[PDB]
Amino acid sequence: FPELKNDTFLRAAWGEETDYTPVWCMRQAGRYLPEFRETRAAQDFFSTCRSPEACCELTLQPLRRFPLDAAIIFSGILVVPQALGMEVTMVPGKGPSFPEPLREEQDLERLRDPEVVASELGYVFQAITLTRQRLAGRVPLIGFAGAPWTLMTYMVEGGGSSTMAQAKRWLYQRPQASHQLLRILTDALVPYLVGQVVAGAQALQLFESHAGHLGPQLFNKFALPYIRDVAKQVKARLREAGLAPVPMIIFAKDGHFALEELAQAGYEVVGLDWTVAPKKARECVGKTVTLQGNLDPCALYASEEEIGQLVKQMLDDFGPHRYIANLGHGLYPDMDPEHVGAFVDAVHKHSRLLRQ
Amino acid sequence: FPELKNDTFLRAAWGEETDYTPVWCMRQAGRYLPEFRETRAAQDFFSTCRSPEACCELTLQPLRRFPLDAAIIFSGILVVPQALGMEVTMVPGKGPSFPEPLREEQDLERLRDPEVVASELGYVFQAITLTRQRLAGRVPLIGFAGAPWTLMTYMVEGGGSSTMAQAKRWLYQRPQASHQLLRILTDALVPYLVGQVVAGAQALQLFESHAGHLGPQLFNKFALPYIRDVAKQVKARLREAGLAPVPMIIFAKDGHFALEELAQAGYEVVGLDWTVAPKKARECVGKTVTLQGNLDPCALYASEEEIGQLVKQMLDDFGPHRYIANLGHGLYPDMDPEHVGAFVDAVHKHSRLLRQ
Ligand SMILES: Cc1c2[nH]c(c1CCC(=O)O)Cc1[nH]c(c(CCC(=O)O)c1C)Cc1[nH]c(c(CCC(=O)O)c1C)Cc1[nH]c(c(C)c1CCC(=O)O)C2
Ligand SMILES: Cc1c2[nH]c(c1CCC(=O)O)Cc1[nH]c(c(CCC(=O)O)c1C)Cc1[nH]c(c(CCC(=O)O)c1C)Cc1[nH]c(c(C)c1CCC(=O)O)C2
C-alpha cells in the first residue's frame, strides 16, 4: 500500500507527542453532506455498503472538504448480524430493523458458525483495500465494528430501543444463552476485524453504542469480558500472521461508569461521550491510554465563533498529550458542513497554540 | 440536434475552401471576461465542471460578445486523471495540484480500469449535450481532452513544472511503467472522446500542452505513439457505432520539432504555438493538413489597430487555404475583451480581403 504521509493520528493513538492534536468526526461521511445524499440516492444502504467504489467515494468525500487527520471506512455495524444469518430491512425515516429478532434460546440455531462470517464480509475488505489505495497515504484509514453487547441488542430488540428491555431481560432471565450469543459475536468479530487490517485498515474502533443501558454490574458481567477478548484476540492473530497490530479504540457511549475498566481492557484509546468532563475522564483512565472525543455534536449548531471557543475550552481540559479530538457521538443529518470545518480548523489552531 | 447553420470551421478543418477564415480562441471562456468571474464565483472549478448548466453558460458567454466561428465546451483537462481515481485540489492563486502524485510503479495500482472512466465522466457528456442544444446550430461545438504525455506529467509531477524533471525521470528510469501509464491514459481517453462526440461534440482537440519539454527522441518514443493511437481508435469506434467521425485537432505547444510527424498522425488539423513561423510550419506539415493558430496571445495587449496589423501579417503568411485562425495559446486573465473582439473582427475582415 502507499506509504502514510500524515500519521499524526496514529502517533497520538499510541501516546506519542505530536505537533498538533489530530481530529476526525464520527459520521464524517454522512447525510449532513449534500454529496453524500446524492451518492446514496442510487442504491439502498446495505447495497451501497456492498459496492467498494461507492464506499470509497463516501469515505473520501469529507476529506475533500476538510483536512481531517483520519478517514473511517463507509460501512455498517449491522453487517455482522447480517453475515451471521439475520435478515435486516432498512425502513424509510425510521431505521434498520430485523423483522425476525432473536427471542428464545432456540433462535441461536439459525446463526452461522462465527468462523465463516469473515468470508461473508469480503465486500467490506474489498472496500477497505480500494479506499486505502485511493487515499494514497494522505491519512490513516480506520476500520470498525459494533461491540458484542451492542450487536446483541439489535439482534434481540430487532432495532433501536429507549430501554433495551428485551435484551436486558435476556441478561437476567437467560444468562447462559446471553453468554452463548455474546461468544458467537466475539468469535465473528475477531476474524472480521483482523480481515479489516489484512485489507489495509490502520486503526480499529469498536462501538459499544448501547453501553449506557447497563449499569456497572451488568456491564462487567456481560459487556466487558467480550470487549477485552476482542482486543486480545485481534492483536494475537495479527502478530501470528506476521502483521503489525494497529491501535484499537473502544467507544462506550454513556459508559462513564466503566471508564476505569475500559482503560485496562487492552485498547490504546478510550473514546468519550460529551457527558463526561475531560478532567474526570483523565482521572478515571489514568496516564497511559489516549482519550478520544468529546464535543457535544449539537455544539456544531452554534456559530463558528462559538464553536472555536468551545473547542478551545475542550482542548484546555484534555491537555496536549494522549488526546485525539472528535465529537462525543456522530454528526447529525441537519448539521452545516461549514460548522464541521470550523470544528476541524479550531482543533488544529488551538492545539498548536497550546504547545507554543 | 439542431442543424448547423455556420459550418465554416468544419469546412476549413477538413481542408475545403471557405469564403472567409474561421476563428476561435483557446480559453475564450475564461477569466478575462467579467461575466466568467461572476458565474464561477458560486462554485469551485471542478464543481462548476460538474454542472451542465454552468458549463453551458460559460461556453456561450464569449459568443454573446464576439462572432466566433466555434464554441469549445467548458471543462477541465484534469477530469481524466480525476476519473482514473486521483484526487485533485484547486489551490487559490497557485493552481491544480495532486497532493498524492504517482511516483513509483506500484502507484499505478490505485487507478481505475480505463474502460470505466467514460462512465465517471457522464457529467461532461451532459454538459456537451445541453450546450449543443442551447447553441441551436449557431456554430460547431468542440470537445477536448489532454494528450497522454501531458496528463502523465500532471499525474507524476502533481501539478505544473518548469522542467518536468520527475515525469522525464520516469521516461528514462521507468520506461516500462511509463508505457503502462501512457497506455492506461490512451485507453481512458478513447472512450471519453468518443462519448463527447456521442453527446454532440462536432470536433475534438487533444492538448499536448507539455510537448516542448521533450526533445524529438523522447517525443517519438513516448508521446507520438499514443497521439496516433487516440486518433485511430476514436475514428474506428465512431464509424463502428454508425456515427460520423469529426475533425480532430492536435495541439503540441512548443512542439516545433514534431510537426512533420504530427502531420502524419491522423489529425485533420495541427495547432501551432506562436514561436513557429507560419511559412515554416506549412513546409513541415505539407499541403493536406489544416493549420490552426497562431497569434502570440500577448499581442492582444497591443492597441486594436496594432492587433489588426499583426493579424493581417499572420494571415498573409498562412495564406487562405487549409487554415483556422486562433492564438498560439489560451487567453490570459488580464486581457481586454475588446481586444479579443478586435482579433476576431480582423481575422474576418482581412481573410475576406485576401480572397477578393
Ligand atoms: C440510520 C442508521 C444507519 N446505521 C445505523 C443507523 C441508526 C442510528 C441511530 O440510532 O440513529 C446504526 C449505527 N451506525 C453507526 C453506529 C455506531 C455509532 C454509535 O451509535 O455510537 C450505529 C449503531 C455508525 C456509523 N454509521 C456509518 C458509519 C461508517 C463511517 C461513516 O459513515 O463516517 C458508521 C461508523 C454510515 C451510515 N450508516 C447509516 C447511515 C445513514 C450512515 C451515514 C451517516 C449518517 O448520516 O448517520 C444507516
Ligand atoms: C488554472 C488552471 C485551470 N486548468 C488548468 C490550469 C492551469 C493552467 C496553467 O498552466 O496556467 C490546466 C489547463 N487548462 C487548459 C489546459 C490546456 C491548454 C494548454 O495548456 O495548452 C490546461 C493544461 C485549457 C482549458 N481551460 C479551460 C478550458 C475549457 C474551454 C474554455 O474554457 O474556453 C480549456 C480547454 C477552462 C478553465 N480551467 C481553469 C480555468 C481558470 C479555466 C478558465 C480559462 C482561464 O481563464 O484560464 C482551471
From Swiss-Prot, chains A, B:
Pathway this chain belongs to: Porphyrin-containing compound metabolism; protoporphyrin-IX biosynthesis; coproporphyrinogen-III from 5-aminolevulinate: step 4/4
Cell location? Cytoplasm, Cytosol
| GO biological process per UniProt | heme A biosynthetic process; heme B biosynthetic process; heme biosynthetic process; heme O biosynthetic process; porphyrin-containing compound catabolic process; porphyrin-containing compound metabolic process; protoporphyrinogen IX biosynthetic process
Positions with a binding annotation for coproporphyrinogen I = R27, A29, R31, R40, G76, Y154, S209, H329
Q: Could you tell me which Gene3D superfamilies the record lists for this protein?
A: 3.20.20.210
The molecular function GO annotations come to: uroporphyrinogen decarboxylase activity
| SUPFAM superfamilies per the UniProt record, alphabetical | UROD/MetE-like
Quote the HAMAP family the UniProt record gives.
URO_D
| Similarity section | Belongs to the uroporphyrinogen decarboxylase family.
Q: Which disease is it linked to?
A: Familial porphyria cutanea tarda: A form of porphyria. Porphyrias are inherited defects in the biosynthesis of heme, resulting in the accumulation and increased excretion of porphyrins or porphyrin precursors. They are classified as erythropoietic or hepatic, depending on whether the enzyme deficiency occurs in red blood cells or in the liver. Familial porphyria cutanea tarda is an autosomal dominant disorder characterized by light-sensitive dermatitis, with onset in later life. It is associated with the excretion of large amounts of uroporphyrin in the urine.
Q: What is the name attached to this protein's record? A: Uroporphyrinogen decarboxylase
- What species was this sequence derived from? Homo sapiens (Human)
Lineage of the organism: Eukaryota, Metazoa, Chordata, Craniata, Vertebrata
- Gene coding for it: UROD
